[PDB]
Design a protein around this nucleic acid. Structure first.
Lengths: 123, 80, 129, 205, 80, 150
RNA sequence: UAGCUAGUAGGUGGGGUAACGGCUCACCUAGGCGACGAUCCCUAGCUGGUCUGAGAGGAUGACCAGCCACACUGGAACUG
RNA sequence: GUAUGAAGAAGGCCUUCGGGUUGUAAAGUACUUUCAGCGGGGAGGAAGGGAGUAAAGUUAAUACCUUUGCUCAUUGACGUUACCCGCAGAAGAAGCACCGGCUAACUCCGUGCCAGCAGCCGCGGUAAUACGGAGGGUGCAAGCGUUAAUCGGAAUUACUGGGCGUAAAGCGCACGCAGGCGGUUUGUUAAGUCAGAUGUGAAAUCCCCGGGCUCAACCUGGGAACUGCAUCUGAUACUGGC
């Protein structure tokens, strides 16, 4: 290659770019939620998926997955969303989380209790 | 010792000054390729024995006006 | 067009020792006879000899080892589009001491070994192994 | 945190004794009568090369009872001073105070020797030491603390240590409960039946 | 003024001092002109636990520089 | 002395007009223990027979290599089409490192002191002959002593 | 992002200022700049460093040091 | 906490039921108490200054101030300090994710193309040890998992260390401005070059080698480098200028 041009314009390569740019370098963000619904999965997986539509304060509007068994969500119910891809959903690169606001407690489990925070018994 | 350069006149359109071009003529530090790298200075001269295309020798001295610090010594090729 | 007098000499050596030639010849110069006297005693050629004085020529007797050339690579590196200068320790190590670098110097054409032994540097001519 | 795993089942698992529940008996040993393979050996699969490394890594760490990040610190300390990562790594584990108390014969197990360090029953240079990770200095004196020098279990560990060979790099007196640590552990008396050609493939990367 | 002072190092409980020539202007831990050695208030088991060039101190006194009482006690700590 | 090694075993499971294959292909190295190295390859129905099919030619295949004091002293490259090898001298108490093929070819040469890397295709049956091409490229100070002068 | 500037380019003189200088007023000559990217926009304080890689390199310059700019917007002068 | 404690108990899990495994674990016994709790004793950070004593201090020997020393009253937010003693008594102190391949740990049950997982593989349509759980196990542990940003794997941006006939691409062809390269011999100047030498290259930080409280964290001495830049005095082959 012409080195007498590399001294003016170097070699350039493709840069890495986010699959979740709407969060803008935050680990989770708040949305009011405009719609809570279900959608049929990608490929022959035959398992109905739970999703919500979220518009963000920065002008983005995206779709999020409702992880953890059991929920109470509606329009204007207010939720937290984070990163993490779902491969069997159309365009769903976001996860909805329930450590904050008004989302109901997850269905209880005896293992892996960090998953959507399985809450300990208390009297 | 003081700093002195050889270069050439590229404009003589003003009376008591000449626009002089100087070069680096050196390798690029990460490519080894020669780079000419021209820079222009607005050099003082009230003698008027030189003009455009003349090869000229200049010296570093004190500022005389805004952004101007270099002055003429001699004509190097003496083509006229 | 015709661009370099040393490529016209190194090609005759490199391709001649690939084609099993006894002795190869090209136009002479002060530099060409200076490097021949290095390549001789460093054991990369078997003889060198000049012919003529007006339009002078140089003939190099090629050297062989175990049915191949005595040389494993003779590389230019210092070329018309890029010349290389090396200082007294900045001199590279060619094939861990199984080869040489050739330096012009202000004090005579020699190896990087002789340049280190003199605390000397200069411009590179070639790297030979 | 503590491992709390089994003492002898692991010795059998790699076919190599860990000086756990086995250092002082030959009869009435309680070692599960040296367990014959039964129908288990016929049903054992081959281990992977990634697993052969891990079997070595865990064995070499657990025989001394040490922390992972400290065992890795010794892998960085064995790389310098022309020490060889395959050679000084063993001597760094062997040179810990918790093993010097063991090689001076004061405890019949490494956990019974580490007990004396962790309960502040040991002193070095006449100063009380509670750090099991301590690297003992050459020509320095290790001794049992005044408030612990009457323990019959230590006199009884020494009653047995008088019947054992000592490391060349240290000495100990069974009366005084005291010994000079002469040198850092040396390859002229340090040997182990471990894969010394395999421990070099660790932490890379 | 230009003064010979102890710069605070060693962090918490066991401080360590670097003896410097510095200007008393503005910043406490500002830039320092020259270092002349180190001082340890804690036992180090070495007879060079504290090191000072008393002739270089005399050279900075030869620049008219100010002395601080803590450095006069350091000159006493090397037994003058 | 024994130096001989097994580099890789590969299970063949495809279906053909003769039925479904249940066979194994092996790759081994041996040498002469005095200055020659070589490799062998072979497929059979049982692994000990595949190892023997390979070993019997690995005991025939030879190339002489310049092995000064059982050590590498210069940087060397080796090539075979899509597979490339690069080997350099290590420091005191350091050595191999690298893929299991290079690890075996150096033991039949008596060598340990090598910093090795592979480039391009990591294919085993090419990277072995590219390593042997890199040993054709290996030089000795004892041979250069017979080249110097005249 | 392809055209930029004409207080701009060169010069001279008055006035002010710690030195120098378009800093400032008035005038004379007619330019100057861009291809090595001026003009325009986006992002960003900079450095010793921080973290990472065998290294070339990559990301990042909080806290701690060595400089900077700023403190509701903008202009201004005075005090030491 | 350390040791010892059985054809191997109570309780579980695997098990045509042979045995296996939890497990020497427990119960039993021995044996030692760190840390903790509480009571007792209690350092160092409190020096520096000040008072007396001494000094032909310097000055004009007892104003200030200085002095190697001696002797004394003094200063604690941290604080129920550090450290040690004493008292029972193993007493008060443990989770997280994973275990079919890459991937170390192994099965058994539930779910049944539904739910639920995933990086690839794809799993699951009622033997998925791939989704939930249990027993055993693996690894790490006051952490462990998850997400975000950005790096190391990456020789896939290219000197170290690639491609353009057919697998990314030689411009359809020629001409050519601006820019780059260019045979030989004898001089000359000494810019580039090479040599010698000095300054500059902060502390901290790193690397390499040491030292300090019982270690490490933390703190700190040494060695090294900062490729260069600035300047001086030489060398003189080759390029540049002549």
């Amino acid at each position: 290659a012409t080195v007498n041009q590399l001294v003016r314009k170097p070699r350039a390569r493709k840069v890495a770019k986010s699959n979740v740019p709407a969060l803008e370098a935050c680990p989770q963000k708040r949305g009011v939620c405009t719609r809570v619904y279900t959608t049929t999965p990608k490929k022959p997986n035959s398992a109905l998926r739970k999703v919500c539509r979220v518009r963000l304060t920065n002008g983005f509007e995206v779709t999020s997955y409702i992880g953890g068994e059991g929920h109470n969500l509606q329009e204007h119910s207010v939720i937290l969303i984070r990163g993490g891809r779902v491969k069997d959903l159309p365009g769903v690169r976001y996860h909805t989380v329930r450590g904050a606001l008004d989302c109901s407690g997850v269905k209880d489990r005896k293992q892996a209790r960090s998953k959507y925070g399985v809450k300990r018994p208390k009297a | 010792k003081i700093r002195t350069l050889q270069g050439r006149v590229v404009s003589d359109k003003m009376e008591k000054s000449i626009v002089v071009a100087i070069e680096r003529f050196v390798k690029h530090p990460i490519y080894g390729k020669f780079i000419k790298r021209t820079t222009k200075l607005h050099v003082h001269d009230e003698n008027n024995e030189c003009g455009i295309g003349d090869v000229v020798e200049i010296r570093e001295c004190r500022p005389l006006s805004k952004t101007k610090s270099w002055t003429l010594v001699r004509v190097v090729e003496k083509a006229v | 067009s015709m661009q370099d007098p040393i490529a016209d000499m190194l090609t005759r050596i490199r391709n001649g020792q690939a084609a099993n030639k006894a002795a190869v010849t090209m136009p002479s110069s002060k530099l060409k006879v200076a490097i021949a006297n290095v390549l001789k005693e460093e054991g990369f050629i078997e003889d060198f000899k000049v012919e003529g004085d007006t339009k002078p020529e140089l003939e190099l007797t090629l050297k062989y080892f175990q049915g191949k050339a005595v040389v494993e690579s003779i590389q230019r590196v210092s070329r018309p589009g890029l010349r290389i200068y090396k200082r007294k320790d900045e001199l590279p190590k060619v094939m861990a001491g199984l080869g040489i670098a050739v330096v012009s110097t202000s004090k005579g054409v020699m190896t990087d070994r002789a340049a280190r032994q003199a605390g000397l540097g200069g411009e590179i001519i070639c790297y030979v192994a | 945190a503590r491992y709390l795993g089994p003492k002898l089942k692991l010795s059998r698992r790699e076919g190599t004794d860990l000086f756990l529940k086995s250092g002082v008996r030959a009869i009435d040993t309680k070692c599960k009568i040296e367990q014959a393979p039964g129908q288990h050996g016929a049903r054992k699969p081959r281990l992977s090369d990634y697993g052969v490394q891990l079997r070595e890594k865990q064995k070499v760490r657990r025989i001394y009872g040490v922390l992972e990040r400290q065992f890795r610190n010794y892998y960085k300390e064995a790389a310098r001073l022309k020490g060889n990562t395959g050679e000084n790594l063993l001597a760094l584990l062997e040179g810990r105070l918790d093993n010097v108390v063991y090689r001076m014969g004061f405890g019949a197990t490494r956990a019974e020797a580490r007990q004396l360090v962790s309960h502040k029953a040991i002193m070095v240079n006449g100063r009380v030491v509670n750090i099991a990770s301590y690297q003992v200095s050459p020509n320095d004196v290790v001794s049992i603390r005044e408030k612990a020098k009457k323990q019959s279990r230590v006199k009884a560990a020494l009653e047995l240590a008088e019947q054992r060979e000592k490391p060349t790099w240290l000495e100990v007196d069974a009366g005084k409960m005291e010994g000079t640590f002469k040198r850092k552990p040396e390859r002229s008396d340090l040997s182990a039946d471990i894969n010394e050609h395999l421990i070099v493939e660790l932490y890379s990367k | 003024m230009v003064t010979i002072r102890l710069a605070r190092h060693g962090a918490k409980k066991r401080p360590f001092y670097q003896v410097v020539v510095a200007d008393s202007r503005n910043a406490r831990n500002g830039r320092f002109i020259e270092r002349v050695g180190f001082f340890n208030p804690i036992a180090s088991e070495k007879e060079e636990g504290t090191r000072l060039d008393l002739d270089r101190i005399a050279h900075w006194v030869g620049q008219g520089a100010t002395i601080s009482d803590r450095v006069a006690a350091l000159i006493k700590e090397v037994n003058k | 002395e024994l130096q001989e090694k097994l580099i890789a075993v590969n299970r063949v499971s495809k279906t053909v007009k003769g039925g479904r294959i249940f066979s194994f292909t092996a790759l081994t190295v041996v040498g002469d223990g005095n200055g020659r190295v070589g490799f062998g390859y072979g497929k059979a129905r049982e692994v000990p027979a595949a190892i023997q099919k390979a070993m019997e030619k690995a005991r025939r295949n030879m190339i002489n290599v310049a092995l000064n004091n059982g050590t590498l002293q210069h940087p060397v490259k080796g090539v075979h089409t899509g597979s490339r090898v690069f080997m350099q001298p290590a420091s005191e108490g350091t050595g191999i490192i690298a893929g299991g093929a290079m690890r075996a070819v150096l033991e039949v040469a008596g060598v340990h002191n090598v910093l090795a890397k592979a480039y391009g295709s990591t294919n085993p049956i090419n990277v072995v002959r590219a390593t042997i091409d890199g040993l054709e490229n290996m030089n000795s100070p004892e041979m250069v002593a017979a080249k110097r002068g005249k």
